[PDB]
Amino acid sequence: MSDNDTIVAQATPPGRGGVGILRISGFKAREVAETVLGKLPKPRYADYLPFKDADGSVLDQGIALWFPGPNSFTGEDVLELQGHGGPVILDLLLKRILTIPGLRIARPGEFSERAFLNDKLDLAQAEAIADLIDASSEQAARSALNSLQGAFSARVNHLVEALTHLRIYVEAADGKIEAQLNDVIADLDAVRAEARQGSLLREGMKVVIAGRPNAGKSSLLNALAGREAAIVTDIAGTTRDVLREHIHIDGMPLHIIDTAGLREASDEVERIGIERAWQEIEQADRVLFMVDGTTTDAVDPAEIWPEFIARLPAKLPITVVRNKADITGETLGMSEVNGHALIRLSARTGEGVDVLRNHLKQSMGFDTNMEGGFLARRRHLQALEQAAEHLQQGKAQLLGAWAGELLAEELRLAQQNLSEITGEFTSDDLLGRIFSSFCIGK
Amino acid sequence: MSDNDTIVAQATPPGRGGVGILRISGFKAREVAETVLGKLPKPRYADYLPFKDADGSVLDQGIALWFPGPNSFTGEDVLELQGHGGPVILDLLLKRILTIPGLRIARPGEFSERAFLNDKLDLAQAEAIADLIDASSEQAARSALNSLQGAFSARVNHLVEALTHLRIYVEAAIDFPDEEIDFLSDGKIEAQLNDVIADLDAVRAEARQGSLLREGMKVVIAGRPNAGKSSLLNALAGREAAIVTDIAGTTRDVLREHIHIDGMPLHIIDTAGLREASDEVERIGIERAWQEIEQADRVLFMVDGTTTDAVDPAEIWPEFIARLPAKLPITVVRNKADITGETLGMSEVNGHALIRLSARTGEGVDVLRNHLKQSMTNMEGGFLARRRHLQALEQAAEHLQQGKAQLLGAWAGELLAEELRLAQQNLSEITGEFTSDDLLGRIFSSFCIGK
Numbered sequence: 001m002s003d004n005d006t007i008v009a010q011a012t013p014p015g016r017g018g019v020g021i022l023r024i025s026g027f028k029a030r031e032v033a034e035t036v037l038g039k040l041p042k043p044r045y046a047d048y049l050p051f052k053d054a055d056g057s058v059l060d061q062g063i064a065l066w067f068p069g070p071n072s073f074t075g076e077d078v079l080e081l082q083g084h085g086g087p088v089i090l091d092l093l094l095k096r097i098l099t100i101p102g103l104r105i106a107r108p109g110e111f112s113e114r115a116f117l118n119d120k121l122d123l124a125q126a127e128a129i130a131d132l133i134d135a136s137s138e139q140a141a142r143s144a145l146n147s148l149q150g151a152f153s154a155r156v157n158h159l160v161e162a163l164t165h166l167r168i169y170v171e172a173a174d175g176k177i178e179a180q181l182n183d184v185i186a187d188l189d190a191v192r193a194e195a196r197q198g199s200l201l202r203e204g205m206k207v208v209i210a211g212r213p214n215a216g217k218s219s220l221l222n223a224l225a226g227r228e229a230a231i232v233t234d235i236a237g238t239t240r241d242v243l244r245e246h247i248h249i250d251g252m253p254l255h256i257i258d259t260a261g262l263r264e265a266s267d268e269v270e271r272i273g274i275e276r277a278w279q280e281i282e283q284a285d286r287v288l289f290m291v292d293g294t295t296t297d298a299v300d301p302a303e304i305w306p307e308f309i310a311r312l313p314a315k316l317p318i319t320v321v322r323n324k325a326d327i328t329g330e331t332l333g334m335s336e337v338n339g340h341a342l343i344r345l346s347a348r349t350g351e352g353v354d355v356l357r358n359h360l361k362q363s364m365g366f367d368t369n370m371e372g373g374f375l376a377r378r379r380h381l382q383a384l385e386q387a388a389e390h391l392q393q394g395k396a397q398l399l400g401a402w403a404g405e406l407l408a409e410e411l412r413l414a415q416q417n418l419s420e421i422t423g424e425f426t427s428d429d430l431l432g433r434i435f436s437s438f439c440i441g442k
Numbered sequence: 443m444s445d446n447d448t449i450v451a452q453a454t455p456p457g458r459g460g461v462g463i464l465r466i467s468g469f470k471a472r473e474v475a476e477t478v479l480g481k482l483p484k485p486r487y488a489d490y491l492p493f494k495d496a497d498g499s500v501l502d503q504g505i506a507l508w509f510p511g512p513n514s515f516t517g518e519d520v521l522e523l524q525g526h527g528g529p530v531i532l533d534l535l536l537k538r539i540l541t542i543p544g545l546r547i548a549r550p551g552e553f554s555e556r557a558f559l560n561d562k563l564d565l566a567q568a569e570a571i572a573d574l575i576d577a578s579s580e581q582a583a584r585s586a587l588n589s590l591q592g593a594f595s596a597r598v599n600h601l602v603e604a605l606t607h608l609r610i611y612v613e614a615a616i617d618f619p620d621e622e623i624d625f626l627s628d629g630k631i632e633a634q635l636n637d638v639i640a641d642l643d644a645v646r647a648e649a650r651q652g653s654l655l656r657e658g659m660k661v662v663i664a665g666r667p668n669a670g671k672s673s674l675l676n677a678l679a680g681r682e683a684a685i686v687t688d689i690a691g692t693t694r695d696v697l698r699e700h701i702h703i704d705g706m707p708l709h710i711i712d713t714a715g716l717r718e719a720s721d722e723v724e725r726i727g728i729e730r731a732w733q734e735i736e737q738a739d740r741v742l743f744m745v746d747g748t749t750t751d752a753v754d755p756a757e758i759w760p761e762f763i764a765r766l767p768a769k770l771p772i773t774v775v776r777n778k779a780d781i782t783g784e785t786l787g788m789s790e791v792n793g794h795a796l797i798r799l800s801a802r803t804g805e806g807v808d809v810l811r812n813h814l815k816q817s818m819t820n821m822e823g824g825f826l827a828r829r830r831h832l833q834a835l836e837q838a839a840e841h842l843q844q845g846k847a848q849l850l851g852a853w854a855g856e857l858l859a860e861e862l863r864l865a866q867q868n869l870s871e872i873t874g875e876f877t878s879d880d881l882l883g884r885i886f887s888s889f890c891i892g893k
């Protein structure tokens with residue numbers, strides 16, 4: 001919002017606790033400090049003093065900190081008033097603070113917003129502030145913090161400076177220059193691949209368990225979860241609603257999706273559930289097939305049920321799992337039929353769940369070989385796509401038409417797209433939309 | 443566990459926030475100060491420095507305040523660390539802190555005790571302190587029942603039982619070496635020890651895979667079939683979750699969704715409409731929903747406006763009110779107001795919320811959201827609760843290791859019994875208390891010692 005307008009916001013999560021901290025920043029911070037305290041303590045001093053109400057009655061007691069700019073989180077004069085984790089007194093204090101003219105509850109991201117407006121840090125580091133306050137896995141949290149340290153900004157600045165030097169080479173105008181044009185491409189491709197591996201643990205992937213009713217997909221999902229996830233019984237059509245479960249096999253996220261058994265039933269609800277499952281199959285990154293071993297010995301996908309193979313689009317990895325393999329006595333392990341993985345295991349007994357977990361871990365591109373790395377965003381991937389497209393078009397134009405002006409224009413556009421994440425060229429609308437998603441008071 | 447113990451705890455409430463506070467009070471305070479920050483900043487100064495680990499990496503960056511006694515909250519060596527309100531990062535930092543020898547996690551409202559008995563806090567509010575401790579302790583006890591609630595609370599049992607059995611066969615032939623019990627005193631004892639160790643790893647590997655905790659406060663929406671439960675859940679979630687139809691008992695399996703409200707997390711629970719079940723699936727789903735109801739935290743009972751104008755929850759369906767736990771807060775959602783036309787808003791009936799809303803269109807949703815946030819949830823939500831279990835089980839494996847190492851030397855059973863007793867004492871913090879008299883009773887019931 002308005003930079004000149006002083007703002008106040010609650011920092012600590014709502015509820016009750018030992019300390020409820022209020023953060024105020026703006027040009028009215030000193031006047032509000034006098035109004036609520038009647039004095040200005042030494043900056044960066046943990047002073048124990050009471051809080052003063054408008055009528056003069058003691059509002060509360062705590063720790064008051066005064067941080068004159070620019071040696072603060074935002075660079076302006078910021079008052080950090082820590083009291084107690086009492087929401088009622090916090091409400092009264094916030095009302096008193098808002099009473100004074102010139103104060104207003106800043107919109108979410110304003111604390112990051114203004115700090116970004118003063119060029120404290122890279123723009124994408126602002127989003128890096130998020131994705132860490134609310135994570136899902138320990139590995140994801142560590143990667144988000146490492147990114148918050150600011151390595152991605154280093155890589156982006158190096159790439160942009162190399163692109164600027166190449167653009168200069170154009171303006172000023174060897175083979176080594178082409179070798180550099182290609183090795184910068186190689187390093188950018190490697191960093192983009194690592195980023196693709198990044199943000200992969202922000203959601204992991206989607207795996208669809210597909211099979212007929214009276215199969216045990218509900219049971220397999222239940223065993224993977226390790227709790228009582230769903231209802232298991234011999235009644236046909238055991239599950240109708242789409243079931244989603246977020247789990248981590250080993251330091252990695254993933255969403256396992258259950259579905260109703262594929263059969264034609266007069267039930268409208270069952271038909272809707274089948275429709276939902278067929279909708280979700282395409283979105284999923286991977287699909288597994290569960291078929292009873294006793295029902296049919298066929299392992300090729302066509303024999304089991306020729307309809308599903310035809311219906312499912314190609315280019316999607318698929319695996320077949322032989323549930324109830326204990327009754328059949330089949331050797332438990334990993335095999336391949338028609339080029340697709342085939343596992344055997346029994347849900348109720350739990351045998352073969354470990355091999356299923358190992359297959360899920362290994363099949364998806366990931367491993368513990370590389371640590372630290374980086375966590376990226378969809379917008380980052382789109383910007384990388386556009387930059388790579390521009391670079392490829394520029395190189396093709398050079399090779400074929402030898403158009404120096406066209407190559408220079410393509411290189412400049414690619415550099416601008418790459419710097420879009422840095423925010424030098426990004427418009428204010430994108431910054432505002434990104435900052436709005438942040439929680440209030442951040 | 444003297445009053446001089448240095449304790450580490452979290453001050454900020456659980457959930458999402460921009461700042462997290464960890465406070466340590468005790469003799470080892472300075473030790474922790476040097477262990478985490480690798481130095482001691484200026485006292486009562488807003489120093490700035492990131493948090494480092496043993497490997498040398500950074501776990502968080504924030505503000506550290508060091509307050510030597512007696513001018514502090516508890517009048518002792520107090521350390522305050524402020525960083526980012528991330529549950530995962532907070533858990534990592536707490537795990538880093540706890541590894542130091544002689545440290546332990548604080549009990550419910552221990553800092554109130556420390557700051558009260560040191561005369562650093564006023565004396566008038568004795569009753570207020572008496573309640574502030576009890577409420578936190580009760581909430582902590584209520585938690586940790588979700589920590590040990592799945593397959594994870596299936597190996598530890600095994601473990602403990604195995605240990606008990608071993609102890610029964612190791613202590614007995616130290617107290618009754620005059621009966622005919624054919625004790626296993628031969629070397630095979632160590633063999634029976636090995637499996638116990640091999641069992642513990644399994645437990646330590648059980649919680650490393652599965653669900654993802656998903657801290658928050660539980661809310662349940664329930665009523666009779668076709669009462670708007672699906673519509674209410676879909677509206678609250680903001681995305682389609684369950685099918686919406688007029689068929690009785692459309693949904694048969696419980697559904698769980700997660701939603702944040704201005705930094706306060708909440709978990710919406712959908713269950714099949716309550717009624718008499720003529721099907722195995724329906725009856726089992728009704729039982730599951732009923733069982734989930736008791737463990738819930740907040741409950742919104744469906745009251746269809748079309749069905750009747752009754753407002754009192756007891757009159758609408760007294761049996762559910764009677765079956766409900768007394769402490770369980772209850773709210774009343776008069777569904778289908780848009781058709782009935784009853785004015786939207788917030789009201790009170792016999793002290794319980796009564797809210798008429800239009801679920802089919804979204805009328806009155808903001809009122810329910812306002813009531814939900816205004817309702818409150820102290821601490822001990824999830825991660826910390828399971829940290830206690832992962833710590834108690836942690837400081838038993840080393841005792842078993844050191845006890846087993848003894849057997850390699852002269853076979854002295856007294857030291858083995860001491861180590862096993864210490865290990866079982868540590869394990870008792872998870873399941874329950876196992877006094878010596880219980881071991882004696884099991885020995886009596888297992889053998890024909892008699893007299």
Ligand SMILES: Nc1nc2c(ncn2[C@@H]2O[C@H](COP(=O)(O)OP(=O)(O)NP(=O)(O)O)[C@@H](O)[C@H]2O)c(=O)[nH]1
Binds near residue numbers: 213217219323346
């Ligand atoms: N012993 C054993 N039991 C199994 C095996 N596969 C499935 N079951 C049993 O199948 C029973 C019925 O579960 P059910 O509700 O049909 O699961 P479902 O997944 O809903 N069936 P469907 O996959 O067709 O949807 C469970 O109690 C489970 O123990 C197996 O390999 N071994």
Ligand SMILES: Nc1nc2c(ncn2[C@@H]2O[C@H](COP(=O)(O)OP(=O)(O)NP(=O)(O)O)[C@@H](O)[C@H]2O)c(=O)[nH]1
Binds near residue numbers: 688689690692780781
């Ligand atoms: N006219 C009207 N209908 C409503 C309103 N709120 C909910 N409903 C109806 O309530 C019905 C509830 O049935 P359904 O969607 O199956 O969900 P449910 O309430 O969980 N029923 P069940 O327990 O049988 O699964 C919905 O189909 C919806 O049309 C409302 O405000 N007005």
